[PDB]
């Protein structure tokens, strides 16, 4: 979905290196360590998460949980505005 992809791009654009590292750690349970090593930005991480189908454009509960964990309510608000 093009709107979903552009929303994901916007979400990945607003992060920083420290938040990127924190997210990379927080996804160690699902994503393998070797694949997490090669990532350079959160956009690739989002694509890889889309790969295992645990995150899908129709249902983004994992994305909401991850964003709420990072104490970034603005991005969660953007996500739920997209949903509505």
């Amino acid at each position: 979905m093009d709107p979903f992809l552009v929303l994901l791009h916007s979400v990945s654009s607003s992060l920083s290196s420290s938040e990127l590292t924190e997210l990379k750690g927080l996804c160690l349970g699902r994503v393998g360590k070797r694949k997490l090593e090669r990532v350079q930005s959160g956009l690739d991480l989002f694509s890889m998460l889309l790969e295992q189908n645990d995150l899908e454009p129709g249902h983004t509960e994992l994305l909401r949980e991850l964003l709420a964990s990072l104490r970034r309510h603005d991005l969660l608000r953007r996500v739920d505005d997209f949903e509505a």
């Binding site: 393998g32 889309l50 790969e51 295992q52 189908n53 645990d54």
Partner: protein, 175 residues
């Protein structure tokens, strides 16, 4: 139907999609193996199973619509309607395999061939391979069939890719 159009299509095709076309045309040419695209097209023309619609369907499957506009002077709507109202030259199994192979990079086919190294040979697939070549090799040993896709689905599941498994389940549900 003329030789000029066949020659122009051959010389307007990149080396990457020639293998795609050869794999796609395996069903029609089941008793012989052609080395290049021109020989395959000549064999189809000789066999009488070649026409404007067949070429349009092949180019639509290979996703090169610009050549359809330039060469065959057709758009997506016309070829799609013709394919809707006519039998398909290529079965959905082959196009599904092509679409699966279109979604795997170079870092996954190596893992696939390593995983299945026990069932099949080793020294033959030691060279760099494409997913279509691996599918052909598996089909040679009669492991994957249009009605039998358990092994491929399980292998795709084992390498942490679920979306392709969902696509396989979708195709199986379709038929």
């Amino acid at each position: 139907m003329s030789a000029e159009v066949i020659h122009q299509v051959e010389e307007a095709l990149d080396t990457d999609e020639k293998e795609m076309l050869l794999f796609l045309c395996r069903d029609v040419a089941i008793d012989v193996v052609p080395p290049n695209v021109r020989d395959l097209l000549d064999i189809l023309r000789e066999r009488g199973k070649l026409s404007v619609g067949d070429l349009a369907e092949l180019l639509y499957r290979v996703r090169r619509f610009d050549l359809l506009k330039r060469i065959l002077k057709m758009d997506r709507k016309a070829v799609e309607t013709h394919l809707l109202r006519n039998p398909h030259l290529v079965s959905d199994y082959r196009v599904l395999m092509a679409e699966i192979g279109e979604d795997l990079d170079k870092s996954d086919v190596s893992s696939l061939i390593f995983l299945m190294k026990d069932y099949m040979g080793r020294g033959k697939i030691s060279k760099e391979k494409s997913f279509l070549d691996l599918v052909v090799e598996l089909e040679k040993l009669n492991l994957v069939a249009p009605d039998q896709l358990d092994l491929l689905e399980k292998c795709l599941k084992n390498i942490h890719r679920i979306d392709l498994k969902t696509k396989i389940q979708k195709y199986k549900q379709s038929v």
